[PDB]
Design a protein around this nucleic acid. Structure first.
Ligand SMILES: [Mg+2]
Ligand SMILES: [Mg+2]
Ligand SMILES: [Mg+2]
Ligand SMILES: [Mg+2]
Ligand SMILES: [Mg+2]
Ligand SMILES: [Mg+2]
Ligand SMILES: [Mg+2]
Ligand SMILES: [Mg+2]
Ligand SMILES: [Mg+2]
Ligand SMILES: [Mg+2]
Ligand SMILES: [Mg+2]
Ligand SMILES: [Mg+2]
Ligand SMILES: [Mg+2]
Ligand SMILES: [Mg+2]
Ligand SMILES: [Mg+2]
Ligand SMILES: [Mg+2]
Ligand SMILES: [Mg+2]
Ligand SMILES: [Mg+2]
Ligand SMILES: [Mg+2]
Ligand SMILES: [Mg+2]
Ligand SMILES: [Mg+2]
Ligand SMILES: [Mg+2]
Ligand SMILES: [Mg+2]
Ligand SMILES: [Mg+2]
Ligand SMILES: [Mg+2]
Ligand SMILES: [Mg+2]
Ligand SMILES: [Mg+2]
Lengths: 114, 56, 120, 209, 121
RNA sequence: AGGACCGAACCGACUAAUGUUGAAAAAUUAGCGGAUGACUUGUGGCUGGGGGUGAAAGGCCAAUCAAACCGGGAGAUAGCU
RNA sequence: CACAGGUGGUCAGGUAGAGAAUACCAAGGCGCUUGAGAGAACUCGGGUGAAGGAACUAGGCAAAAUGGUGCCGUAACUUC
RNA sequence: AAUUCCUUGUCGGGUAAGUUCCGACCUGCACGAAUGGCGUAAUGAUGGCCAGGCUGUCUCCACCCGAGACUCAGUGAAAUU
RNA sequence: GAUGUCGGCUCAUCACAUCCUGGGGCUGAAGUAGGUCCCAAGGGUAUGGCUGUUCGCCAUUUAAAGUGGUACGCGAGCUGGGUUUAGAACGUCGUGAGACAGUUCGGUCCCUAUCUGCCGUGGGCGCUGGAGAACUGAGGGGGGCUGCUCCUAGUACGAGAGGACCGGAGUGGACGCAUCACUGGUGUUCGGGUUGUCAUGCCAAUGGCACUGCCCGGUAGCUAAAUGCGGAAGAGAUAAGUGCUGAAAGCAUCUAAGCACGAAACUUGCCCCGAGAUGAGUUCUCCCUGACCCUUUAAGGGUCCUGAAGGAACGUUGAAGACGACGACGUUGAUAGGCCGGGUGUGUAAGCGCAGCGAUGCGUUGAGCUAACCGGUACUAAUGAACCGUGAGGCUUAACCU
């Protein structure tokens, strides 16, 4: 802890934007594909949330080809690269798992707006 | 489940070889008073490690 | 396994093991001295100090919150006003235990929980 | 070669340039000081005894302080033998550090254990549980049938059945060495070694490939 | 994923409900996922399609609820278990189209014909 | 209107667990069936043993029933232990 | 037995409720005549469980589930 | 078939796979007409089979809250031998 | 004067007439695959549908789904489906009561373990002066499974089709251990929402009870589904086997002399226990070097003065733990609690202000509260003593030394 946390505070990336259990964010992660190594983006909605130092995640809900998908990113993972926000929203909660049963009109979340 | 043979009075004694009681390793006394009290806690009236807590 | 688990359950449901301390707490804040069980004492300890530490500030919420726990506007008054300033400088150890143990009915070990500044 | 005594506390990650979050147990080697050398003329075997900690010099028996004095005294959690071959060390605290490792990918790591105690089959033997319903009287998670009958007579030894689980050497073998960064007295491995932090460990080069 | 277990069709022909009747890959093999072959049994099927209820073939688990984790630990999960039926005799899909996003875990020489269809990852 | 419907009291007793040197010589707990009727309940009465009563199981007739309990014939008889 | 059983009649407050259900209370009466610690296996009674969902088993045993009022609406068959 | 010994009869249905189940055949060991024959809406804590829902029933068990178990103080059994 | 039946469950243990994997001989053995016999028991050796089944048939797997002994292993361990009680019915037999090695629906499964035996864990004493440590390692146990892909090599072999050996590399299934860093579970000790009702005079704010009342999320810890590692190589001696040189036996021959290879078996290597290893071992360090008497004399016994090393006791406690045990600390202090700061978790308190008739909304405010966590801090509790344990260590011989 006192010896550790150093090897963490030494790894932890300081290049990370704000967040919220309602924001959209567009995580841009690597891919490698085959012989290439592009940068895949992930447009979703933060439901769960990190906060554990070097170890941290956001868990984003997307719902691609008519099928709901959920991904848990490791914030300080070199494969995370960048991470936008796109849209922040008002939730009034810390974990929006009550969204795994919503969909359009019901899954709607009023934007943040300050 | 019951005994098949009446346990000799000897066997009984051996079983009670660990039942023996323990002394007290000698108890301490107080400074302010000659209180022959137990180690770490209040004397017969209100003393302990010198001083004198607990009114009367 | 209890590995690294804090808190003593004594021998009852949290429900009970809350008000029994809530009473024993205000009880201490009152007579400033009590003769309870050693374990039941080294417990009441980290239940009143947090209250006194809370009594450090007059406030108007820490007062209500002080009323939340220990439902006694009587003692909440004793706190903030008395023990409040009484230990306004006290680091943290506002209690003593003064052992004695050995009760009649039960060989249970008793103890003398008391505010550090109780002697007059 | 020989090994070094350390203290557990690790369990973290180290992201690779590629993108791998490698697990890791942060062992701390405060450099071991050979408190005594053992020869085959005054012992019967080539061994080295070292130390690493630092006793408060208050809880150390004189017979201990006298032992340290006999050599390069400097207290220490305790003593630790290290069978060596074809290579000796200076009887005096030759002060060996984590640098002892580097081109050594082996490692074993030997901690105390977990400490369950409670035991009870199914948890310390991975036994099976009998239908939690469909009848079964007071015989859910229980041993059930430990022997056979008259022919056998008794209950064969080794017969698994509850009893203290934990507190026992147990090594790990293999385990890669992430970083052998001395200076700060550190040694990182792939991860997962006995102990629960602070527990004395004996990390040495793997005996197997 | 384990005996029984109802999965969805990630391709076409004989869609909907299809029960897994055996997890291939070795003795006492517990469950399956990511991109493993599974013994299926068409339970719904469409009126036309290419396969009809009752058929006993094999399929690849394209999606699972548990998900899949990659090095860093980051996991990817889907709300439902989808799979793709493949010719019993010699692997490879039987459908002409694959529905829903798959995982890069199927980028294997064999499970190639699928990762090359619309969706993603 | 109803040997009608749902459901407390009240009556009953299909299932499971626990109890089995029980809290209890048949119960406790969670469910369950009837619940204006061939219903249920208090008090008192009348049927007596080869007899009674029985929507019939040999069921009940005072923790006893293919013939009650008590006293007697009686120290039945026992080629058996 | 100072026994978790049995025992007929009368009375019938407040909030919510169809209600003598039920939950919280009034009047009133109680904490059940061994207690104090600990926080083991295992037994008993419960709460929550990833993915699967009867694969359990003689048997879905036990659990889980359903649960109200109003309205929409409702098959074979029928002694209507 | 609450009736079939050979018996898991034969065929069809349901299932990935059905000694059970449902629909048939008739070779009824040994159905059959008030010790009633074949049907029958409704009813059933009735026997068998299936399905949806549901789940720790199970894969495979994990954690947690309480009553014991363990410790101390008081009282203090049992069968058996 | 009672040894509970079949099947299932749970847990097994042994045999070898071996199912798989390993080593070989012959083959009507091209290869790949087989056939049969010899050796080999290390390890491994299927989920379901039907039925009470065991078995069996069937579906689908696997490297394989071995045979058998163990009261047809296992009920003072579980089940109670089959099967012998009492209810009832069918077919059948009998005048009938009733009956069936026919069927059918229903039908109480007790025991707090004294002894042996196992699994754990202590308390004595003994190891010959007493201690604190570190070892040595006689022995004992644990583990021993295996698929697929690739390279060799599309080569050997083959008409092709097909397709190796040998050796090497990678990744899996099942199993075992460990550990919570990751993914998650739990988390009635943390935060919040909410239904009914009671109370704190009322508003407001709160608390009790209703499964934690119902519910949402969740710290530490514990966890598996999570994650990391492991059944190896290599040695010795071999099995079956293959043989060399070789006479009896002018040749021949694996053997009689004499030599060499040879398998998951055996010994070892790997991990754990381990000197009660009474054959009680070893090395390092530490401590005790005052006086007298009775003596029935090497045998002592007893007195006063002395009490060391270390231990134990008590207290604060632990990722240790049923209790003992083991570990840390005791003012020469961070061992617990509290306290400070942070983290985390919830999710923007109360009060006040403002907008709306109002429910309520916005602002202050991302607030408030926040545990077992991290960093630190003597505020409280860990009192001077006291208790145990002694006072130079038997003889005989040898080696030195004097
Ligand atoms: Mg409550
Ligand atoms: Mg029972
Ligand atoms: Mg014998
Ligand atoms: Mg009626
Ligand atoms: Mg009714
Ligand atoms: Mg009467
Ligand atoms: Mg009677
Ligand atoms: Mg006579
Ligand atoms: Mg007589
Ligand atoms: Mg009483
Ligand atoms: Mg679940
Ligand atoms: Mg089944
Ligand atoms: Mg089965
Ligand atoms: Mg049920
Ligand atoms: Mg229920
Ligand atoms: Mg079925
Ligand atoms: Mg029929
Ligand atoms: Mg007839
Ligand atoms: Mg009739
Ligand atoms: Mg007791
Ligand atoms: Mg007692
Ligand atoms: Mg053989
Ligand atoms: Mg079978
Ligand atoms: Mg048997
Ligand atoms: Mg029994
Ligand atoms: Mg039966
Ligand atoms: Mg009968």
């Amino acid at each position: 802890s006192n010896i550790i946390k150093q090897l963490e505070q030494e790894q932890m990336k300081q290049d990370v934007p704000s967040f919220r259990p309602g924001d959209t964010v567009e995580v841009k992660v690597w891919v490698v594909e085959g012989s290439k190594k592009r940068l895949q983006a992930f447009e979703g909605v933060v439901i769960a949330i990190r906060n554990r130092g070097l170890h941290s995640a956001f868990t984003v809900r997307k719902i691609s080809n008519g099928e709901g998908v959920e991904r848990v990113f490791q914030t300080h993972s070199p494969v995370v690269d960048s991470i936008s926000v796109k849209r922040r929203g008002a939730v009034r909660k810390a974990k929006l798992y009550y969204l795994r049963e919503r969909t359009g009109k019901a899954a709607r979340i009023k934007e943040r707006l300050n | 489940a019951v005994q098949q043979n009446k346990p000799t009075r000897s066997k009984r004694g051996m079983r009670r070889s660990h039942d023996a009681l323990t002394a007290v390793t000698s108890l301490s006394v107080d400074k302010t008073s000659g209180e022959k009290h137990l180690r770490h806690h209040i004397t017969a009236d209100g003393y302990y490690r010198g001083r004198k807590v607990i009114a009367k | 396994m209890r590995h690294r688990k804090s808190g003593r359950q004594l021998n009852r449901n949290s429900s009970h093991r809350q008000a029994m301390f809530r009473n024993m707490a205000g009880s201490l804040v009152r007579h400033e001295i009590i003769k309870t069980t050693l374990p039941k004492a080294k417990e009441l300890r980290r239940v009143v100090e947090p209250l006194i530490t809370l009594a450090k500030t007059d406030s108007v919420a820490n007062r209500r919150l002080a009323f939340a726990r220990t439902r006694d506007n009587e003692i909440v008054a004793k706190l903030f006003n008395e023990l409040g300033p009484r230990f306004a400088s006290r680091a943290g150890g506002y209690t003593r235990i003064l052992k004695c143990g050995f009760r009649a009915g039960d060989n249970a070990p008793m103890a003398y929980i008391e505010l550090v500044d109780r002697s007059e | 070669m020989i090994g070094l005594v350390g203290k557990k506390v690790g369990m973290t990650r180290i992201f690779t340039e590629d993108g791998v979050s490698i697990p890791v147990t942060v062992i701390e080697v405060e450099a071991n000081r050979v408190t005594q050398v053992k020869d085959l003329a005054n012992d019967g075997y080539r061994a080295i005894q070292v130390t690493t900690g630092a006793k408060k010099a208050n809880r150390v028996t004189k017979p201990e302080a006298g032992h340290f004095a006999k050599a390069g005294v400097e207290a220490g959690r305790g003593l630790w033998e290290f069978r060596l071959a074809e290579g000796e060390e200076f009887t005096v605290g030759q002060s060996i550090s984590v640098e002892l490792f580097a081109d050594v990918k082996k490692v074993d790591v030997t901690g105390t254990s977990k400490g369950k105690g409670f035991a009870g089959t199914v948890k310390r033997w991975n036994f099976r549980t009998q239908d939690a319903t469909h009848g079964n009287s007071l015989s859910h998670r229980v041993p059930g049938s430990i022997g056979q009958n008259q022919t056998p007579g008794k209950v064969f030894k080794g017969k698994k059945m509850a009893g203290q689980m934990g507190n026992e050497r147990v090594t790990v073998q293999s385990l890669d060495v992430v970083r052998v960064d001395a200076e700060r007295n550190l040694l990182l491995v792939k991860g997962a070694v006995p102990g629960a932090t602070g527990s004395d460990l004996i990390v040495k080069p793997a005996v197997k490939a | 994923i384990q005996e029984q277990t109802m999965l969805n069709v990630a391709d076409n022909s004989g869609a909907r409900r299809v029960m897994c009747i055996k997890v291939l890959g070795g003795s006492h093999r517990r469950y399956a996922g990511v991109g493993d072959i599974i013994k299926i049994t068409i339970k719904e099927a469409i009126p036309r399609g290419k396969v009809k209820k009752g058929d006993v073939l094999k399929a690849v688990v394209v999606r699972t609820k548990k998900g899949v984790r990659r090095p860093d630990g980051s996991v990817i999960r889907f709300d439902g278990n989808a799979c793709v039926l493949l010719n019993n005799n010699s692997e490879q899909p039987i459908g002409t189209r694959i529905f829903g996003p798959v995982t890069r875990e199927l980028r294997s020489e064999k499970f190639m014909k699928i990762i090359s269809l619309a969706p993603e990852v």
